[PDB]
Amino acid sequence: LHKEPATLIKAIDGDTVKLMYKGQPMTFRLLLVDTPETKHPKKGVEKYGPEASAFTKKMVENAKKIEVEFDKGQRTDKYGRGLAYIYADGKMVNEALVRQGLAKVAYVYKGNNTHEQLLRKAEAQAKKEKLNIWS
Structure with a gap:
């Protein structure tokens, strides 16, 4: 995989960020993670959804460098969002959240599983520590 530079435009949700990527604004869905949503069809505000959103926002808003890493499977979803791992000062946001x-950790989507093990390990640890959603 190759890391590419991007610039923050706006963080939307725990799982979604809008970035300037190769000169054009684009919505990115973070790969392999499911966060509680603030912008859910029904249920509206799920528990820890506002916590996940603020976490993502804080991480990308305070970074001096944002990088996007596409995986080797499909690169956009049916809503037109890019499917990627996002890095803030070298730290993967997807992993930090889990x-x-x-x-x-979400089920793998269309060949995109490069960091699944890494993420599943992070999740097991969070469950063991009974953190947040796992409390």
């Missing part, structure tokens, strides 16, 4: 107990 490790903090603020997301679960």
Whole structure:
């Protein structure tokens, strides 16, 4: 995989960020994670959804460098969002969320599984520590 530079435009949700990527604005869905949503069709505000959202926002808003890493499977979803791992000062946001107990690992989507093990390990640890969603 190759890390590419991007610039924050806006963090939308725990699982979604809008970035400037190769000169054009684009919505990115973070790969392999499911966060509680703030912008859910029904249920509206799920528990820990506002915590996950603020976590993602804080991480990308305070970074001096954002990088996007596409995986080797499909790169956009049916809503047009890019499917990627996002890094803030070298730290993977997708992993930080799971490790903090603020997301679960999602099922693999269309060949995109490069960091699944890494993430599943982070999740097991968060469950063991009974953090946040796992409390």
